[PDB]
């Protein structure tokens, strides 16, 4: 395998044309750690402080013909413990 | 003194090129040695083996020898050595030799502060 | 594909592109199609006769 590129299967996306629509969209993997560490708006919004963490990326290109897409995460690769876990594909950046 | 701004340092490789199977023999130092065995997997470039150093790993010439602070380390041993760094004080930073005594280090640090010559291992209490 | 490089190598490319635009004009295309078919058919009939 080549861990710099991830493969994400998105519900209701079963054609290559469907996966083309999501090219360039933001992708987020949500998990939690053991200790509460620094997050965005740590001082501004103390209610956001949690063990919950996110790793972000973007969709680069469709994979195959059945709606699979390739995702590249910011800098680092997605952990292998995320295999089989939920990935969030947002509707922004929007071309509509 | 602020160091001269250079392009981003890439650092093609971070891990060392350690000797093959040094972790299994305590007498074997981790220092690199070219494997010359006729059946050596490392020498034969097997996929899941340790890599070997070569010319390709060489670092970019524009940022070579640059410390994370942005200076280049120039070893110094006394006060008079600092005057060599007066003009190019944004390029080089002095490194006091380990065997230089505390008595002499006090004079070296004080003179460096006046000359605005960065010391890599000087008194970090000064310069804030 | 690059505009500057193509024009630098071929200063006549603007003339060629203008000719391409005219050929792809729909009114020009239909009129040319009618004229070409008519005059080729006439030449064939006259040569046969």
């Amino acid at each position: 395998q080549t861990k710099q590129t991830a493969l994400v299967r998105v519900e209701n996306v079963n054609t290559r044309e469907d996966a083309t629509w999501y090219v360039g969209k933001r992708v987020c993997y949500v998990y939690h750690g053991k200790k509460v560490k620094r997050c965005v708006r740590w001082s501004k919004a103390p209610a956001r402080r949690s063990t919950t963490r996110a790793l972000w990326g973007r969709v680069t290109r469709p994979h195959g013909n059945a709606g699979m897409m390739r995702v590249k995460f910011n800098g680092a690769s997605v952990p292998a413990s995320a295999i089989g876990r939920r990935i969030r594909v947002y509707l922004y950046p929007s071309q509509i | 003194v602020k160091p001269t701004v250079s392009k981003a340092i890439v650092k093609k490789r971070t891990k060392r090129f350690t000797r093959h199977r040094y972790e299994l023999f305590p007498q074997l130092s981790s220092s690199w040695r070219k494997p010359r065995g006729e059946d050596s997997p490392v020498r034969r470039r097997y996929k899941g083996q340790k890599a070997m150093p070569n010319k390709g790993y060489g670092s970019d010439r524009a940022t070579k020898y640059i410390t994370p602070s942005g200076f280049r380390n120039f070893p110094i041993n006394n006060v008079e050595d600092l005057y060599m760094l007066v003009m190019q004080n944004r390029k080089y930073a002095g490194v006091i030799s380990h065997t230089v005594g505390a008595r002499k280090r006090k004079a070296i640090v004080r003179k460096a502060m006046e000359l605005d010559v960065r010391l890599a291992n000087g008194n970090a209490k000064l310069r804030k | 594909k690059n505009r500057r490089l193509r024009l630098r190598l071929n200063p006549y490319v603007k003339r060629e592109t203008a000719a391409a635009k005219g050929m792809r004009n729909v009114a020009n295309r239909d009129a040319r199609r009618k004229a070409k078919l008519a005059r080729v058919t006439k030449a064939k009939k006259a040569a046969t006769k």
Binding site: - | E80, M84, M87, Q88, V95 | -
Partner: protein
């Protein structure tokens, strides 16, 4: 009889003024405006040379070997002191009168000399303020003669 070109060939690789440390070739030549080990910057080697040195206070001294007495070591280098507030371009012109190919480095060195004098005064004032609030066990005083 023995030119700078010949002398540079002789001493380029080995010289008491050459400081090769950690892969860096520098020079502690007192007549080197830069510290770089090049033929142009070797003030001790060149027939004519100039160097920008500090003086007591904010004054800037220019030491010139004009070539007339290179065989007289005590008469080789002559010092002329420019009073504090001298423009760095004036010091550059003074160096350029002998070595036109050292004008740019001499100007920068003249600026650096002024900056160091100002910073030394500022650092010394701060150090004295810190020292005035400390009771020192010992204080050494050189005996006057």
């Amino acid at each position: 009889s023995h030119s700078v070109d010949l002398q540079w060939v002789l001493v380029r690789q080995n010289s008491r003024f050459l400081q090769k440390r950690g892969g860096i070739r520098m020079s502690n030549d007192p007549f080197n405006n830069n510290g770089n080990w090049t033929k142009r910057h070797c003030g001790f080697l060149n027939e004519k040379a100039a160097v920008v040195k500090p003086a007591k206070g904010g004054a800037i001294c220019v030491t010139v070997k004009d070539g007339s007495s290179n065989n007289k070591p005590r008469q080789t280098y002559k010092k002329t002191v420019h009073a504090a507030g001298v423009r760095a371009s004036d010091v550059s012109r003074a160096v350029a009168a002998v070595r036109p190919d050292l004008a740019d480095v001499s100007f920068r060195r003249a600026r650096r000399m002024a900056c160091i004098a100002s910073r030394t005064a500022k650092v010394a004032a701060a150090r004295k303020a810190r020292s005035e609030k400390i009771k020192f066990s010992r204080k050494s005083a050189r005996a006057k003669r």
